[PDB]
Design a protein around this nucleic acid. Structure first.
Lengths: 228, 31, 88, 170, 131
RNA sequence: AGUAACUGACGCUGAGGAGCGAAAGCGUGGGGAGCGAACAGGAUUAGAUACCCUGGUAGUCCACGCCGUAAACGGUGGGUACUAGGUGUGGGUUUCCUUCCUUGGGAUCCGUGCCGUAGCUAACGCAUUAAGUACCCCGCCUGGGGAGUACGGCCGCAAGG
RNA sequence: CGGCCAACUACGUGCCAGCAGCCGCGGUAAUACGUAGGGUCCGAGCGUUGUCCGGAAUUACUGGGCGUAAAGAGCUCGUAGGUGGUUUGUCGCGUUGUUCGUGAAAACUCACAGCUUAACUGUGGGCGUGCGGGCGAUACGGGCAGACUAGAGUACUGCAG
């Protein structure tokens, strides 16, 4: 039940990892060979894990659930952004505000304020006050919309979190673990498998490999929203 | 550990050594 | 320490057979020769304490080997003691 | 219906250029008396407010005690920080025998008959933590049989099975 | 030097268990094999076997972990040790975890658990506790 | 370290005991450039039995003996087995890139650092060189002063221990 | 009758007179002193002092510790002692099962009985944790007689300081 074949993600460079020095000894399970000072990830484990990840995503979205797309490293920013937009799902691309999930009630007020300021823009109140105030207000609008791109659809909570390069966004994974929300991650050779539930071994430093993985997850969630 | 304890011990030791020096001949003659 | 020819001669003399070097007899004989050489050396250099510590270590090792040989078989112990001119 | 135990109120203070700023910390136990307990430690400038934060924190963190009828499954010893609390099951009708912090935790958890002793670090917060650590070391006999893959009779003594039978009959 | 082979075996088991190793190897002896048999029959380890080492024989023990990666052994303590040795009569046999654990006892009829020894009315040396 | 030819448990610890043990100090005999307790002046200071300056004796050095203490500290007794890794550096054996020049790289045994898991700890931190997990033996602790002092004893030429 | 620790007000006094097991209360508005109301705990008793155990895991066998809180001898060698790898046979010393003798009575504990109840008394079991004799077992420890090479040591070849 694999959308992509064993050559697809291999061409992208999913078997690539990090240097042997910066490896995590807990990943010896999925390590297949070390070449040119870098570790090569076995792809058979990747396939037999992405199938399970696909199944979990299907059963979560089909039962009236949502997934949250996480990626901040510049390699996998536009990919997650465009996939979330094309499937209409929440996403974070600029920067993870520490405590979106744990401090949900407080950060929802930011969305309320953004909507209020959009209404103020629609009514046209740009001249009723001082120029400094309206300039600062426009700057606040830009900052709030830029930092919260996919956050305007957060009603209750993300039922699952999809994350690239867990080492980079350790705060988001930690927040999910605190809340108990299942986390689906693609772990590189330097990552910790004890924190994710549904790992997908592979490279995250390549734009193409992360893009392909986002394609796979987006297809899963799209078909699941099809089968509601 | 604080040096205060070392200071107390050293003052006791210094006073005792001074006392021993002050009565050397007296101790020798009584012993 | 002893040269290879001295070791060969001592081992041929005190060894249990023509190949053994780790028998308590051979070890004790070699230790006795080493200790005599060290005592002669220390008779001249009285203030060579570092070598004297090695002398003490050799003496202790020989004592332990003799203890083992006496516990295993007293006749061998007596023969070795009389042949090497030792007291205890 | 939830019972609560405010076991300790402490007035802490931090120094500033003007002087001392006093606040209040309250350690609160929340349980239902049926097998679930929670521990909260709230701090605020006023005692009732701190108690409220402690109560909400205790309600947030809940944990189920493996009771067998009216007592714990087996003797345990739990240590947290420098606090050491030992727990020992007792025959029915003995009552709770514990110090103030341990007594509060056990009565909140619904334990009726137990011998409990504190063996270090009389501090109430650490004694409560040690009691919770001890309670978290208890293992239900069914889980024990599952771990070793044996029938419940081959793992537990007959007395425990009889006690379970009587408790479920009642 | 090595003083207690049994304690060393127990600590190898404990250290492997804490590190979630699936395998532990140690030099072989009849006593170690017998307590391994008792451990396997009581369901505390998965399986064991003896290979041949470079000098003598080895003991290979498989550790049992549950589906959620939870250890099947909670503790391993050596009771009777060189120096202070512990012997129990048939009536004052120790209880481990209030009966939830197993106490290995070396009786003249072989290696038995506390329940087996109590049933057969024999005493001996309390080797260890498992729970 | 390698070979493993030899012996075949001969191992570990060790009360008491014996030996070694920085510097200062002590005895006898030499030596004495520089430095330099004590001691002299000068200066600073309210006062300088000090800091600073100019001199300067024991001592520092050698031979042979005493003494037996130190923040004699890693403030961590010795032996053994096990428990993620990463990276420097010292000693030695070896396979493969092979130019075989090259820290080429790997593997391995023995050291010596740094960073870091699990675990431990009151915390700081330790963390395969444990302060982790265990076993054997030894030394020591039991609130702070009085006091490592008095008394008695042993050792020492004495200081004193 | 402030908190530990059931039970609070008024008047008098004012760093006094006094109280106090500890923390500590007496500075004209004391629930801590003295006295009155009220209250609480016990009750033919109630308090104080003295002594022992407990709390005290605060001598830690059960059941503690030693980097910085008190605590690793300055370091080694080694005596007595303690402790000891794999394996075969044997002994039955330790260990273990059973049996017999003994472990006075009283006491303690269980049941019953008699004092109008209780204290108390009696009766019958248990207990008397032990020791001695016979018989059984040999897993472990130990002894005895062997064996093995992974510890330990020797030999040989190199090596660094």
């Amino acid at each position: 039940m694999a959308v992509v074949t064993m050559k697809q993600l291999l061409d992208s460079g999913a078997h690539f990892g990090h240097q042997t020095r910066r490896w995590n000894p807990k990943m010896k399970r999925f390590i297949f060979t070390d070449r040119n000072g870098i570790y090569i990830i076995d792809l058979q484990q990747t396939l037999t894990y992405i199938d399970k990840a696909y199944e979990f995503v299907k059963e979560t979205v089909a039962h009236g659930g949502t997934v949250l797309f996480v990626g901040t490293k510049k390699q996998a920013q536009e990919s997650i952004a465009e996939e979330a937009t094309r499937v209409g799902m929440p996403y974070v691309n600029q920067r993870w505000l520490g405590g979106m999930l744990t401090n949900f009630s407080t950060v929802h007020k930011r969305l309320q304020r953004l909507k209020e300021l959009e209404a103020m823009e629609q009514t046209g109140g740009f001249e009723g006050r001082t120029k400094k105030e309206i300039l600062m207000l426009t700057r606040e609008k830009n900052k709030l919309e830029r930092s919260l791109g996919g956050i305007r659809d957060m009603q209750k909570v993300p039922s699952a979190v999809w994350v690239v390069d867990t080492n980079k966004e350790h705060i988001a994974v930690g927040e999910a673990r605190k809340l108990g929300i299942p986390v689906i991650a693609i772990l590189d050779t330097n990552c910790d498998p004890d924190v994710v539930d549904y790992p997908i071994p592979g490279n995250d430093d390549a734009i193409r490999s992360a893009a392909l993985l986002t394609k796979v997850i987006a297809s899963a969630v799209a078909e699941g929203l099809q089968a509601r | 550990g604080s040096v205060i304890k070392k200071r107390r011990k050293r003052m006791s030791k210094k006073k005792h050594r001074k006392l021993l020096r002050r009565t050397r001949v007296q101790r020798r003659k009584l012993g | 320490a002893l040269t290879a020819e001295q070791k060969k001669e001592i081992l041929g003399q005190y060894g249990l057979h023509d190949t053994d070097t780790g028998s308590p007899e051979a070890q004790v004989a070699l230790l006795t020769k080493r200790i005599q050489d060290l005592t002669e050396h220390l008779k001249v250099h009285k203030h060579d304490h570092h070598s004297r510590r090695g002398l003490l270590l050799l003496v202790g090792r020989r004592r332990r080997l003799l203890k083992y040989v006496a516990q295993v078989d007293v006749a061998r112990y007596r023969s070795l003691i009389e042949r090497l001119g030792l007291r205890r | 219906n939830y019972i609560e135990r405010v076991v300790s109120i402490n007035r802490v203070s931090k120094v500033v250029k003007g002087g001392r700023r006093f606040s209040f910390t309250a350690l609160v136990i929340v349980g239902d008396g049926k097998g679930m307990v929670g521990v909260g430690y709230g701090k605020a400038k006023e005692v009732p407010a701190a108690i409220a934060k402690g109560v909400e924190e205790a309600r947030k963190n809940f944990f189920r005690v493996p009771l067998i009828g009216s007592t714990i499954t087996h003797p345990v010893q739990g240590e947290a920080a420098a606090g050491v609390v030992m727990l020992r099951p007792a025959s029915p009708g003995t009552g709770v025998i514990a110090g103030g912090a341990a007594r509060a935790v056990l009565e909140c958890a619904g334990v009726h008959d137990i011998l409990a002793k504190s063996l270090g670090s009389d501090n109430a917060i650490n004694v409560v933590h040690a009691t919770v650590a001890a309670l978290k070391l208890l293992q239900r006999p069914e889980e024990v049989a599952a771990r070793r893959g044996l029938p419940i009779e081959d793992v537990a003594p007959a007395g425990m099975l009889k006690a379970r039978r009587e408790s479920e009959a009642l | 030097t090595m003083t207690d082979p049994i304690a060393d075996f127990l600590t190898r088991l404990r250290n492997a268990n804490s590190a979630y190793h699936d395998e532990v190897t140690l030099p072989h002896s009849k006593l170690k094999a017998n307590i391994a048999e008792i451990l396997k029959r009581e369901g505390y380890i998965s399986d064991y076997r003896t290979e041949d080492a470079r000098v003598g024989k080895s003991l290979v023990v498989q550790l049992k972990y549950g589906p959620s990666r939870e250890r099947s052994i909670a503790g391993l303590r050596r009771v009777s040790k060189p120096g202070l040795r512990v012997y129990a009569k048939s009536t004052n046999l120790p209880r481990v975890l209030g009966g939830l654990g197993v106490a290995i006892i070396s009786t003249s009829s072989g290696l038995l658990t506390d329940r087996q020894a109590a049933r057969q009315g024999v005493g001996g040396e309390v080797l260890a506790y498992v729970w």
